[PDB]
C-alpha cells in the first residue's frame, strides 16, 4: 500500500510537470476525474490502458508510470546460502564444464549484480595464451573481485595482449567494463578456485542509458571523450566546455583577459592551465573549475592488488573491527571494497554508518549477527558463512562476533551530481524533491 | 520495428546482467527458448504476462522492460505555432482566468518541459504584496523564463518573503525548484505579458528519484549536504568522503601525514585546506580532488537577469549570429540560454554543434531557416514565428536568413559523471554501451 502512495506521488508529479491539473488529465485522457483522484490519492493503482493513453497525448514514456517496488523495507536483506545453492547453474565453454554461478543478495532497489563463481577448468601452467582459458566479450557491468583459492586471473589490456594474474585468497581486482576476462583454478589446487564477482552499474544504467540509446551512435558517441590520459582529459574537458559557451576564440580571450595566443598554447597541449588559470577559464565558460578539472590521475583499465599490499586499521578507536583495503580505482570514487575482520561480542550498539549502497557477504567459518536500526524499529539477524546481505544506504548498523566479512559500497545512481543537486535544492525540500504530495498551485488561491 | 530491436537488446542487457542465458531465462521463467529467442531478436514485444514473472524471480522492476520511444527520428523535431494554440488552455486562480498555457516542442528523451503560458492577470501597483498575485506551491521542475512584454516576475526568498522583479522583452531569469512564485501582467500596458517559462529536470528525475524513494526519509535526507554557502559545501563534502573511507581520524592524519591542529582547523572551519593540501585529502580518501571540491561560488536561489546586463558576441568570426548570453547559474553548469539575432544568407557550413540537449523558440517576427544532418541525410526546414523545436545533443544545424530566436541547452542525465563514465569506458566500446547486442560470452569458446 505504501507503493500505491508512492505510485500516486509518481503520478501527480507526472501532471504537474506537464502543467495538467486533475481535471486536465480527465478530460484529455477520456477518463472520469474519479478515477484521477483515486490514482493521485494512491487508492487505485494506475492501468495499462491509462498508461497509453496517457503515452499517446503527452511527452511521457511509459517506464514513467512504473515505480520500483521496495523489496528490503526492513532496512537490511539477508540471502541465505542455501538459497545461493538453489539458484546453482553450469555454464560449459568450448564443450567443458567452465564456471558455477550462484546468486547472492541482491535488491531491486540496488545495482548490485554480485555473483558466486566457481573455477571448474584447471590449467597445468601459468601462461596467459593458454587455450584452455575460455574467454569472454567483456560485458557491460563493473566488475570488482575477491579471489579465494589458487585463482588464475586472465585479462586484455587496450592493445589486445592477453595477461594473468596469479591470485590467491585475499587478493583483489577491478575490470572495466567491455574489457574481455576469465579465470582458471591452477592445477594442484586442494579445491577448486571461487571468487567472488561483485559486479554492478553505476552512471550508465536505466535512464541514462534510455537517453542515449535515441541518439545515433554518431552523435552518441561524441559523448565519449578523450581520457586516454590526464592531458587529454584536460583538453577535452575544455573543449567541450568551451563548445557548450558557443563563445569564439576572440570573445573567450577578451572575457578572461588572456591574450589569442596563452589560450593556443592551452588548446594545443602546449601549456597546461594552472589552478588561478583554470577558475578564470571556469568562470568565463559559465561552468565550475571543479566541471573542468579532470581526476586527479588516470588509472589502468585492469586493476589488481594482491592481499599483502592492503592497507588496514583498527576501527573504531574502540577496535571492534579491522579495516582491510581492497582493490578499487579512483575512475569510481563512491566504489569502496573492504574486508572486515570483526572481533566484537558485547554489544548490540550500532558503530558503522555510511551513505552508500552495501553488499556483504560473509568469508569466514563462523557465524555473525547484523544489528541495525530502520524506522524507529531495531532488528538482528545472523549471517552464516556464505551468506550475503544488502544494506540501504546511511542505515546505521554493526557487525558482532569473531569472524570474516567482504564488503563493496557503491554510489548508485544518487553520489556525485545527484547529491550535489539535491543539496543545492535545499533540505527543507528533500522530502517534496523526493516524492511530490501537492499540486503545484492551489486553484482557490493564496489570498 | 527499431523499437523492437531496441526492446530486445535491452532484454539481453537484463539477462548478461544476472549471468542467464537464454537457456537459463527460458527455464527459469518457464517458457520456451525459442520465445526468449524470438524476444531477443526482435520478434516479438515481450508479454506482460512474462514480464511479470520475471519481477517475480530476478532482481528487475517492471520499468526496467519499456524502453523510450524515439519520436524525434530526423535529429529535429518541429512544433507549429497552431499546434501550440490547439494544446491552449486557460487556467483560473480566485474565481478569474489567470495564465493561458500553450505546449512548445517536446521531445519523450528530452527533459524539455516548455510552456508558453500569457499573463491575464492585470495589476495596478508594483506591490510584490499585491493581493491579486495568486502564488504557487512551487514545483519539482528548474525553470528557466524568457520575458515578453510588461511582465511582473513575484517570487520568495528562503525567509518566506515576497519579491517582485518588474521585468521587460529580453530579460530572464532562473528559479530554483520548490520556490514559490506567480507572474502578472502590469496594468497600462498594450497587451498581455508572456513568459516562456522552459522548464526542465536534471539530475534528480526518473530512476534517481526512484532510488531515493524506496528509502526512509530519515535515510534520504541525509544525501541532502550543507550547500547554504561555500564553506558550508566544503566542510559537507570532507566529511562525507571521510565517512565513505570507514577511516579513523587518527589512521586520517597517518595517512595525510598532517598534524592534528591542522585536521582539527578543518573540521571546525577556522581554515579550510589549500589547494595542495586538498590533493593530499583525496589520495588519503581514495577520491578525486574534483570530488572534494564545492563550487566556485554559491549562486542565489533566484537569478534575475535584464536584457542590458546580458554580454553579447558576433559568432562566428564571420558574423552570421549575434548571440546574447541570458540568465544562468553555475548551480547548473549545463544550463546555457541564449537569445541569438540571425542575420545571414548564404553560408553553407552547418556552424552550430553541441553536446547538450537543446529547445528553440521563433520570438522574432519573421521565419527563419534551419539546415541540419542527421544519420547520413540532410534536412532543410521552415521555423516560422511561434513555431518551436527541439534539438538532439551533437546534431550539426545552422539558422539561416533575418530573424532573433531563443535557446535553452541543458545536459540532462548525461552531462557530467555519466559522461565521465562513459569516456573512462572508451569511445571504441560506446555503442555496446549505450545497447547491447551480443551475449556476454560465446558458449562454443574463444
Ligand atoms: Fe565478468
Ligand atoms: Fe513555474
Ligand atoms: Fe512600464
Wanted: include cysteine; charged fraction near 25%; aromatic fraction near 10%.
Amino acid at each position: 500500500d505504501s507503493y500505491l502512495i508512492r505510485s500516486g506521488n509518481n503520478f501527480l508529479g507526472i501532471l504537474n510537470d506537464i502543467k495538467r491539473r486533475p481535471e486536465d488529465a480527465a478530460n484529455e485522457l477520456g477518463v472520469s476525474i474519479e478515477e484521477i483522484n483515486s490514482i493521485i490519492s494512491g487508492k487505485q493503482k494506475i492501468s495499462p490502458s491509462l498508461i497509453e493513453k496517457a503515452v499517446n497525448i503527452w511527452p511521457v514514456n511509459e517506464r514513467d508510470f512504473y515505480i520500483v517496488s521496495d523489496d528490503c523495507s526492513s532496512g537490511i536483506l539477508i540471502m541465505t546460502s542455501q538459497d545461493s545453492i538453489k539458484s546453482s547453474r553450469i555454464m560449459e565453454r568450448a564443450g567443458k564444464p567452465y564456471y558455477e554461478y550462484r546468486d547472492t543478495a541482491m535488491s531491486k532497489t540496488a545495482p548490485f549484480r554480485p555473483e558466486w563463481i566457481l573455477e571448474l577448468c584447471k590449467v597445468e601452467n601459468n601462461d596467459p595464451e593458454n587455450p584452455k582459458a575460455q574467454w569472454n566479450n567483456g560485458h557491460f557491468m563493473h566488475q570488482f573481485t575477491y579471489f579465494i583459492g589458487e585463482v588464475n586471473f586472465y585479462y586484455k589490456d587496450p592493445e589486445g595482449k592477453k595477461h594473468v594474474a596469479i591470485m590467491n585468497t585475499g587478493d583483489s581486482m577491478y575490470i572495466t567494463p567491455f574489457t574481455p576476462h576469465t579465470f582458471t583454478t591452477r592445477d594442484g589446487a586442494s579445491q577448486n578456485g571461487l571468487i567472488l564477482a561483485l559486479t554492478y552499474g553505476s552512471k550508465l544504467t536505466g535512464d541514462i542509458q534510455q537517453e542515449l540509446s535515441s541518439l545515433s551512435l554518431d552523435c552518441g558517441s561524441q559523448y565519449a571523450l578523450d581520457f586516454t590520459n590526464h592531458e587529454n582529459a584536460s583538453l577535452s574537458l575544455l573543449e567541450y566546455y568551451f563548445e557548450l559557451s558557443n563563445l569564439t576564440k576572440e570573445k573567450f580571450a577578451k572575457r578572461t583577459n588572456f591574450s589569442m595566443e596563452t589560450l593556443a598554447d592551452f588548446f594545443t597541449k602546449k601549456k597546461l592551465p594552472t589552478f588561478d588559470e583554470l577558475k578564470i577559464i571556469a568562470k568565463a565558460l559559465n561552468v565550475n573549475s571543479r566541471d573542468l578539472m579532470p581526476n586527479d590521475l588516470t588509472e589502468s583499465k585492469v586493476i589488481v592488488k594482491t592481499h599483502d599490499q592492503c592497507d588496514h586499521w583498527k576501527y573504531p578507536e574502540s577496535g571492534n573491527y579491522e579495516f582491510y583495503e581492497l582493490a578499487s580505482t579512483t575512475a569510481l570514487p563512491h566504489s569502496k571494497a573492504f574486508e572486515i575482520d570483526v572481533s566484537s561480542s558485547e554489544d548490540l550498539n550500532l558503530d558503522l554508518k555510511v551513505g552508500l549502497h552495501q553488499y556483504v557477504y560473509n568469508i569466514g567459518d563462523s557465524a555473525l549477527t547484523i544489528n541495525w536500526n530502520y524506522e524507529n524499529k531495531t532488528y538482528q539477524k545472523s549471517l552464516n558463512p556464505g551468506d550475503s546481505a544488502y544494506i540501504k544506504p546511511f542505515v546505521p548498523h554493526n557487525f558482532r562476533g569473531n569472524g570474516k566479512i567482504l564488503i563493496l559500497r557503491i554510489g548508485g545512481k544518487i553520489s556525485g551530481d545527484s547529491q550535489r543537486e539535491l543539496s543545492f535544492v535545499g533540505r527543507e525540500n528533500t522530502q517534496r524533491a523526493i516524492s511530490e504530495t501537492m499540486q503545484w498551485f492551489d486553484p482557490k488561491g493564496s489570498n
